[PDB]
């Protein structure tokens, strides 16, 4: 089955996913939602009817080659994936391709940036971390630069591309890998987060 | 309530089998159609094959060439799904899910998923260590160099489940996996709340408690 | 004749299997024709020629039907035998020949010399316009019930809740 591989949609307003086949229109049509990390979920059954628990505003449906999904006033958290299925004689069970549906509108989050030094357990591991732990930001892009005492660090640093929270908002993880000697002989270290334009930047210090 | 549960992550070598397991329960397990689907980290989801255990036939996709086998336990009310001649194709999360197509419901429940990673090296476990500390205060752990993902990490044994917020893991040069997960609190709890931080890495059978206070 | 989805079953009503449609009969009723029903009548000397069973007047069966183990089928269904189904006369072929139609989650299975063997989806067609009805399947048939959470009001015949 044909889906378009993104959808955006303005918060408020009506998103529509399609789904084409050959005979569609003679088959039951099956939608499912994925959130990043989590198991996919039935949201439409039969064409147009859906399960218990589902709002009100999943609507579906099948007729000739296309099966549309529809969902009326779209919020932030249905920003996930969204497939489609149906049954053929031949090939038994089909997917669809899948649907990213980006809801448009959302307002702007700064990050909440906690740096945490070194452990004392893993300085006596011989081996010393820095995490810097960034949350509760849209949009889900930043940049972030690390800092020995006052000069750029570049080696050693393992930023994770950012993804979605339990709180629909983004979420990103970066990791300094130094040497204990590293961290004792300086006098700070410093994750620096830039989100848009406004930079926030989080210190801590070996004492 | 009806619930399908699969066995625990694995890791296995270019070659070899694997062979993942799907419980059943809350329903007549003859009733309904059990099928395997997989998804890629990338891609989308990917029907494989079923059991239907009313008649002990199975149907396999043309693209897994006799790959796929999928054998049943009624006893167990439990199905297997065996894959063999692993290759790097196959690193990719298994799930199970029922259908019927008598009453027409689709996939309507799911299992929890079942990551098989497919690499040349073997299972490590991890080194925790504590992550030490509105009016709120941030504490957390740091799960360090295990391989394979994933690692699952509740606190207090599940029973604080506000403010907890685990990381995507992250992939060093040596190519062993580490994350974070922290949690959030008021800081008056602090001294008077312990915080219990428990990971569990299935794939080498490991299970770590980490008791995260203020130095 | 052909029984489609607008077919209207006198005194009964239309149910669906794998690979064809009916007319069921209400009550007690018995089958005149593919599309009425009437009261069936054992057959006495004033009761000739009247309905003693499907199909079936005075107790032989009609033209082109056999009385095979107490019902009556159609002639060219004598010794098919589908399983999880029922054998109807094959629409398209001239010489109207017996295949099988499945229940509901079965299909006729090509290993199997076409019989209901195979798991396989068949999607309902009827148009169930009553008050509060829709298209479920109920006892391995389509057929026209309540929707999800009506209970048929016998004081008025109508799905309420």
């Known amino acids: ?207 | 309530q009806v619930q399908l549960v699969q066995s625990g992550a694995e890791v296995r070598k270019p070659g070899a089998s694997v062979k993942v397991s799907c419980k059943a329960s809350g329903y007549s397990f003859t009733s309904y159609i059990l099928n395997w689907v997989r998804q890629a980290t990338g891609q989308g989801l990917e029907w494989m094959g079923w059991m239907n255990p009313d008649s002990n036939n199975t149907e396999y996709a043309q693209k897994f060439q006799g790959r796929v086998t999928i054998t049943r336990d009624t006893s167990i009310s439990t199905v297997y799904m065996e894959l063999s001649g692993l290759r790097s194709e196959d690193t990719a999360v298994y799930y199970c899910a029922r259908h019927s197509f008598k009453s027409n419901t689709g996939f309507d429940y799911w299992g929890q998923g079942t990551q098989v990673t497919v690499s040349s090296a073997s299972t490590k476990g991890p080194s925790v260590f504590p992550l030490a500390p509105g009016g709120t205060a941030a504490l957390g752990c740091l799960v360090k160099d295990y391989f394979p993902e994933p690692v699952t990490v509740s606190w207090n044994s599940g029973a604080l489940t506000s403010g907890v917020h685990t990381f995507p893991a992250v992939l060093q040069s040596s190519g062993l996996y580490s994350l974070s997960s922290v949690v959030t609190v008021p800081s008056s709890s602090l001294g008077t709340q312990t915080y219990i931080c428990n990971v569990n890495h299935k794939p080498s059978n490991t299970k770590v408690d980490k008791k995260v206070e203020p130095k | 004749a052909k029984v489609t989805v607008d077919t209207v079953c006198k005194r009964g009503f239309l149910i669906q299997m794998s690979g064809h449609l009916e007319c069921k009969c209400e009550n007690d009723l018995v089958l005149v024709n593919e599309e009425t029903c009437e009261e069936k009548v054992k057959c006495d000397e004033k009761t000739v020629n009247k309905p003693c069973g499907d199909f079936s007047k005075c107790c032989k069966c009609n033209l082109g039907y056999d009385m095979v183990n107490n019902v009556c089928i159609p002639n060219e269904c004598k010794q098919v035998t589908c399983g999880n189904g029922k054998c109807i006369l094959d629409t398209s072929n001239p010489v109207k020949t017996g295949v099988c139609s499945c229940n509901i989650g079965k299909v006729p299975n090509v290993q199997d010399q076409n019989k209901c063997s195979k798991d396989g989806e068949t999607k309902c067609s009827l148009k169930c316009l009553k008050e509060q009805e829709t298209c479920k399947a109920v006892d391995g048939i389509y057929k026209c019930d309540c929707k999800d959470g009506f209970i048929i009001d016998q004081e008025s015949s109508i799905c309420t809740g």
């Open chain 1, 1 to 207: 089955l044909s889906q378009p591989p993104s959808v955006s949609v303005s918060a408020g307003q009506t998103a529509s996913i399609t789904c084409s086949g050959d005979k569609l229109g003679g088959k039951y049509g099956y939608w499912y939602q994925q959130r990043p990390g989590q198991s996919p979920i039935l949201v439409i059954y039969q064409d147009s009817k859906r399960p218990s628990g589902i709002p009100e505003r999943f609507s579906g449906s099948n007729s000739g080659n296309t099966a549309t999904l529809t969902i009326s006033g779209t919020q932030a958290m249905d920003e996930a994936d969204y497939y489609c299925q149906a049954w053929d004689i031949s090939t038994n069970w089909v997917f669809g391709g899948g649907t990213k549906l980006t809801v448009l509108g959302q307002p702007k989050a700064a990050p909440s940036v906690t740096l945490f030094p070194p452990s004392s357990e893993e300085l006596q591991a011989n081996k010393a971390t820095l995490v810097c732990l960034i949350s509760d930001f849209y949009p889900g892009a930043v940049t972030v630069a690390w800092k020995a005492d006052s000069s750029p660090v570049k080696a050693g640093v393992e930023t994770t591309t950012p993804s979605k929270q339990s709180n629909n908002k983004y979420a990103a993880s970066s990791y300094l890998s130094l040497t204990p000697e590293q961290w004792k002989s300086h006098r700070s270290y410093s994750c620096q987060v830039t989100h848009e334009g406004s930079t926030v930047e989080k210190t801590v210090a070996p004492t």
